Amino acid sequence: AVGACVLCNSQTSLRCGACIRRPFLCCKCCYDHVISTSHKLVLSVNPYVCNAPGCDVTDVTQLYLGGMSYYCKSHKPPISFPLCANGQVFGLYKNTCVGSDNVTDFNAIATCDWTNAGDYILANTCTERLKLFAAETLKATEETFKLSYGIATVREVLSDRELHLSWEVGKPRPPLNRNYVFTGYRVTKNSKVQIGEYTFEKGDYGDAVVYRGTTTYKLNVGDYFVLTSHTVMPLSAPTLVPQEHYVRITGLYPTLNISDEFSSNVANYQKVGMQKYSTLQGPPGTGKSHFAIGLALYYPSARIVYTACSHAAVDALCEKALKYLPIDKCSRIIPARARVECFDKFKVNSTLEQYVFCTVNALPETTADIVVFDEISMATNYDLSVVNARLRAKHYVYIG
Amino acid sequence: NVIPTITQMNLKYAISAKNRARTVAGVSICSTMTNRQFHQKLLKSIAATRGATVVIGTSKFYGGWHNMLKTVYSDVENPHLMGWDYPKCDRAMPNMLRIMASLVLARKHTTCCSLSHRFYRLANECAQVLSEMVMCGGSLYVKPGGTSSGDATTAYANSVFNICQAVTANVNALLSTDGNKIADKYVRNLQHRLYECLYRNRDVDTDFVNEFYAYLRKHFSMMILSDDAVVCFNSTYASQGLVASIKNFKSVLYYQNNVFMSEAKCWTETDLTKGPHEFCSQHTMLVKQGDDYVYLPYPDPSRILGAGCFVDDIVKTDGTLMIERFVSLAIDAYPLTKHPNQEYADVFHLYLQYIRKLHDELTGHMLDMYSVMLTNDNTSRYWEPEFYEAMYTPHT
Amino acid sequence: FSSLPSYAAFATAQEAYEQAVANGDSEVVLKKLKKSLNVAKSEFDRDAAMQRKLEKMADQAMTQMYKQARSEDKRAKVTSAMQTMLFTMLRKLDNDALNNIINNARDGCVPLNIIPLTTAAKLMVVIPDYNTYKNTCDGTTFTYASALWEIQQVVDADSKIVQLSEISMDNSPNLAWPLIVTALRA
Amino acid sequence: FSSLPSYAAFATAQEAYEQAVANGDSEVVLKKLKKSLNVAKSEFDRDAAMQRKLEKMADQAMTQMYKQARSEDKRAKVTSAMQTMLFTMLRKLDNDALNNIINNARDGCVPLNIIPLTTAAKLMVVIPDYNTYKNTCDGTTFTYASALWEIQQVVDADSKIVQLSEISMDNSPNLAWPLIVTALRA
RNA sequence: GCGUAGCAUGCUACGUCAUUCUCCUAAGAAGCUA
RNA sequence: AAUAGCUUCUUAGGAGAAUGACGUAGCAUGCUACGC
Ligand SMILES: Nc1ncnc2c1ncn2[C@@H]1O[C@H](COP(=O)(O)OP(=O)(O)O)[C@@H](O)[C@H]1O
Ligand SMILES: [Mg+2]
Ligand SMILES: [Zn+2]
Ligand SMILES: [Zn+2]
Ligand SMILES: [Zn+2]
């Protein structure tokens, strides 16, 4: 059960239990995270609580390594050693971790509640590993906040799609939009059991609402709807690939004169082939994605992937691609999601089409020649990590 | 009753020196259970008897090779150790000799089982091992004959067939001699009674069988491990024509096995001291040790080096378990340390230094991962040439 | 075993035995202190046995966790270890032919089939650019893997045979690269 | 152990003995307390050893029961698997022609090889070369074992399909021999 | 002269603890030979 | 992903034996308090 110090990249065998994501910490790094922050739950290959039955000394600073088992001061074994000593914490590879001074920033990112611009403005400018960590922990934090608001119940039965909802009085109510789905638990006494997933819509008058469930279950009065959970997996791949230049064009092959109506962009169509990655700022209502399709023509057989953050945006761009390209084109966007609908054109899972149009949530893990994310003004460092992780291509261009 | 069966066929994955792939046949359990119950007593009684012809289950360690080699010279007159080898022994043994082998191994239940019982047992063994329904790659087939190497009674059946070829060649070589030129007055009478007891008679002759077998055991001492033989035949006779010779073995294999044993693989040593040229793939040297002289077995160095350098699985490539996988190689390669050729003298100290270096890097990594180590001291006894030198002495 | 409890008790018992045999005491007190020595030795011995047992119990885990970690590590990351070791050995081989084909394979010109051996057999290697072209090509001899081949039928990326004349830097930018060359061993 | 009757008697015996020694009476009470604690510790050894045996005995019995349950579970599962395979195999064979030929046989005994040789409805020829192809199963229909078959699919060694046109004397090298060609009785 | 008692010593039996040895079983990892 | 034989190593268990120490009972001997 080993890993790399999220600050010093040495092998370590520890984690912070009180910190939300429990990241690997080198020995001195964990010492510094635990000395001056209220976080005092450190997990080794086994937890560090005193193993004496009924002893709950949980501050790592107050335990002792015994023989085979650690303990608290009162219940300590005859001979043993103090754990937290000489600015270090006894962990595997104790001597060969280096440890660094990124302690203040990490403390901040760990204890903060993100409610002020500090966390964003700081995660935007910190170290890459630390950046990714801040992104994952912010996601998990907002996910945990999702749990704070309450449950819905039924009040009166009227029809199959006209129901009166009842909010648990005294808790934040959820916004009635398609982006909320809840599992329906019915309590007989004796078989508190889910009935299926449900989504609501505030009709023309309250408290009547029109709604859709995944199943055609008959809604009784003993039913209620509780929010459905969501988690976060950890990501490793970089956010922004290190920039590189060259003196020739490789992997992509030019064209002679095709599509003269895409003329002015060729001067930039070449430099993209010369560099490893680049960006295009497009003022509102400009020729953006026109340049995209034009380069797509300029390099015809070069396999291309398009991606964005907005489903409306990726739909619009896949349609525009349908307007001028051989088809011979797929938009593997969403099979059974996207409450506001989208393409109904081609495959979702075949990994064969040259020009793959997809969304971050449903990106596969394939290769290609060039990939282009779009609309960078909305996506976050996390989304950047996903789109750089799942795919792998020669050249990268972002337009926004 | 009888019970046909299906036996699979798999390619083997192990070191070798010829680019042909060797297969092995794994017989179906419904046959091994019965064969085991039927033969186990005799087989576990053959593998635990020291000082007889069939030498199976006699280690070469702790002074075993020297005792084998000094038993073979059971006081023959002018020794000349020889050898031989059968080509394609597993795929040419005629059905008749396999049946004779199974009969001679089933000749012990003279009182446990009745006669019809013995016959149905033999028919069962024939239909299960000899001519079965091989299943080679998702499609049945039919074996024409010839033994299979995955049943219970394999090495012992091979040993029996081997002794049968030796005695047949001997009989042929004694008959074919002219007869009027044999000077002695005993062996000539022996031939003159051999032919008559062979063809001009119909029932057993136990007294004469005994005399012939004693004559053999006094001029043709053997040592047999399932097809690897070593003979110590008297030589004046063998030249006058009265015991076997490589020419006679060539002939016998020509009309009974139906192959041709070219004489490029039948080593014939003429000096008794230096021992057999090659038996069971271990040359033999004579090495002074403790004021008396003993024989020692020593492998072929290239094989040891190969077994160290090329491993079959990826996890066996790190010196985690190697600290143990090397003690065994060194144990097998010790006798090279008394050879006169220098590289044979060095393929020992190579392993011996490698073990030490392995253990030192091990303590390094361990004292890094934690900071302590208590009693892994005994390993200081594997990198000294005394522990192995204990392994070829006769006390235990 | 100093810091252990019973070392002190047995030590003081042996010390008192010494002080009494040197003090010229009687034999009855000698026997009772012999008893004290026996019992202290007993307790210290039992505790020492217990501690030694705990030691030999810890060592099992201390030496098994290491095998586990190392073995799972080796087995997991192998598909890269093999390739890295391969290219290390291949640099260290220090051959010329291999070095030429490797550099070429780096900067684009890869072959599409097993290079043959005999003095009459086919070979189809691509060429991605004019620069690399004039780097390798010369007249009718196309040098590769340190041998002498002859150019047979240059083909464009649109299945359009071209002769050897048109291949010229100024004339280059109108061909649809990459070409595909076939050859024959001299 | 602590719940044994000797435990409390022994503890209070040692306690009251220490109390009387703190009282410092005549040594007859010392002898009495020695005797008391002696017999107490004797029966204490007795019961301690009994419990020590009981632990191992119960644990042996329990692991034995686990082993028995495991064996029975596996046994029942394997028997079900065997029966299922037997019945699903049986319900396949072409019962009609088999009934025909067996009931034709004068005893109900027919050597095994002719059973497939005369009731199989398929034929999986395997061919190692264009020549034996030409000479065994040419064209679209062929004859073997005195009956008329017809091709239906010619899958090569890579488990691909091969149109009957591709197999031509000049198109031999591109086809990864052997050539598993099936058929159907007709 | 005897017994009760006490002490000391030698012997025997029993019941605990520790050290070693020996053997047997079981289970596991690795090597070699036909 | 077979049959068989040998050998190195590790753990657990059992059995047995030796040794030493502790405690109980019994046997022997001596010294002495008391009693006749
Ligand atoms: N070279 C051009 N000639 C004519 N129209 C162009 C050219 N480049 C871009 N456009 C047009 O701009 C229009 C779309 O702009 P839009 O994509 O709406 O702006 P933005 O993408 O920045 O939000 C399209 O009609 C597109 O063809
Ligand atoms: Mg756009
Ligand atoms: Zn660190
Ligand atoms: Zn913390
Ligand atoms: Zn405690």
Chain E nucleotides close to protein (CB under 7 A) are 6-9, 15-19, 29-34
State the CB neighbour count (10 A cutoff) for residue B59: 9
Expressed in angstroms, the distance from the first to the final Cα of chain A is: 42
**Helix H or strand E encompassing A65:** strand A63-65
The resolution of the experimental structure, rounded to one decimal in Å, is 3.5
**B143 token code pair:** 């074996």
| DSSP-based helix, strand, coil % in chain D, nearest 5 | 60, 10, 35
Give the span between the Cα atoms of B117 and B99, in whole angstroms: 16
Give the span between the Cα atoms of D177 and D158, in whole angstroms: 9
User: Is the Cβ–Cβ distance between A292 and A372 less than 8 Å?
Assistant: yes
Domain encompassing residue A312:
265-400
Q: How many Cβ pairs within 8 Å bridge chains A and C?
A: 26
Give the span between the Cα atoms of B298 and B334, in whole angstroms: 8
User: For residue B267, which phi and psi values (nearest 5 degrees)?
Assistant: -65, 145
User: Is the Cβ–Cβ distance between D180 and D156 less than 8 Å?
Assistant: yes
| DSSP class per residue in B281-330 | TBEEEEEEETTEEEEEEE--HHHHHHHHH--SSGGGSSSSSHHHHHHHHH
Measured from the CB, is residue A287 less than 6 Å from ligand 1?
yes
Chain F nucleotides close to protein (CB under 7 A) are 1-11, 13-14, 20-25
Torsion of Cα atoms, C85 then C91 then C96 then C97, to 10°: 30
Would you call the peptide bond into A207 cis, given omega within 30 degrees of 0 as the criterion?
Answer: yes
Give the span between the Cα atoms of B374 and D119, in whole angstroms: 74
Question: Which residues are C183's β-sheet partners?
Answer: C123
Kindly give the number of the ligand 1 atom that is closest to the alpha carbon of A286.
Answer: 22
Across all strands, nucleotide nearest B8 (CA–C1'): F2
- Asked if strand E contacts C42 at the CB level, meaning under 7 A, the answer is yes
State the CB neighbour count (10 A cutoff) for residue B81: 25
DSSP H helices in A256-310: 266-274, 290-298
Which CA distances in Å does A302 have to A299, A368, C133?
A: 5, 8, 22
Scan residues 342-381 of B and list those with Cβ closer than 8 Å to A: 368-371
Inter-chain CB proximity B369 and A95 less than 8 Å: no
Beta strands in chain C (DSSP E): 122-127, 137-138, 141-143, 148-150, 179-184
**Helix H or strand E encompassing B24:** strand B23-24
**C135 token code pair:** 């780097």
Q: Which ligand is nearest to the CA of A282?
A: 1
**C38 CA to chain B: closest CA distance, Å?**
29
Give the span between the Cα atoms of B390 and C13, in whole angstroms: 46
Ligand 5: centre distance to CA A18 (Å):
21
Give the span between the Cα atoms of A130 and A105, in whole angstroms: 9
Vertex B361 angle, CA B355 and B366, to 5°: 125
CATH number at residue A311: 3.40.50.300
Using an 8 Å CB-CB cutoff, list residues of chain A that contact chain C: 2, 45, 67-68, 78-79, 248, 250, 253-256
Sheet holding A370-374, edge to edge: A277-280, A395-399, A370-374, A304-308, A355-359, A330-331
Torsion C10-C16-C19-C21 (CA) sign: negative
Q: Which ligand is nearest to the CA of A52?
A: 5
User: For residue B255, which phi and psi values (nearest 5 degrees)?
Assistant: -110, 5
Instruction: Return the residue matching tokens 């459905």.
Output: A228
User: Is the Cβ–Cβ distance between D152 and D186 less than 8 Å?
Assistant: no
Torsion B276-B277-B282-B285 (CA) sign: positive
Radius of gyration of chain C (CA): 42
- Asked if strand E contacts C31 at the CB level, meaning under 7 A, the answer is yes
Expressed in angstroms, the distance from the first to the final Cα of chain D is: 85
| Residue closest by Cα to atom 6 of ligand 1 | A287
Residue A255: exposure state from Cβ atoms within 10 A (0-12, 13-18, ≥19): middle
Q: At what angle do helices A27-35 and A103-111 cross, to 10 degrees?
A: 60
User: Is the Cβ–Cβ distance between A231 and A143 less than 8 Å?
Assistant: yes
- Asked if strand E contacts B307 at the CB level, meaning under 7 A, the answer is yes
Torsion A331-A336-A338-A340 (CA) sign: positive
- The method recorded for this entry reads cryo-EM
**D134 token code pair:** 């030409």
Chain B residues with CB inside 8 Å of A94's CB? 371
Question: Which residues are B228's β-sheet partners?
Answer: B225
**B347 CA to chain A: closest CA distance, Å?**
37
Ligand 1 mutation pick, A280, A290, A293, A399, max ligand atoms within 8 A of CB: A290
Q: At what angle do helices A381-390 and A128-146 cross, to 10 degrees?
A: 110
Sheet holding C137-138, edge to edge: C137-138, C141-143, C148-150
Residue A104: exposure state from Cβ atoms within 10 A (0-12, 13-18, ≥19): exposed
**D3 token code pair:** 């719940």
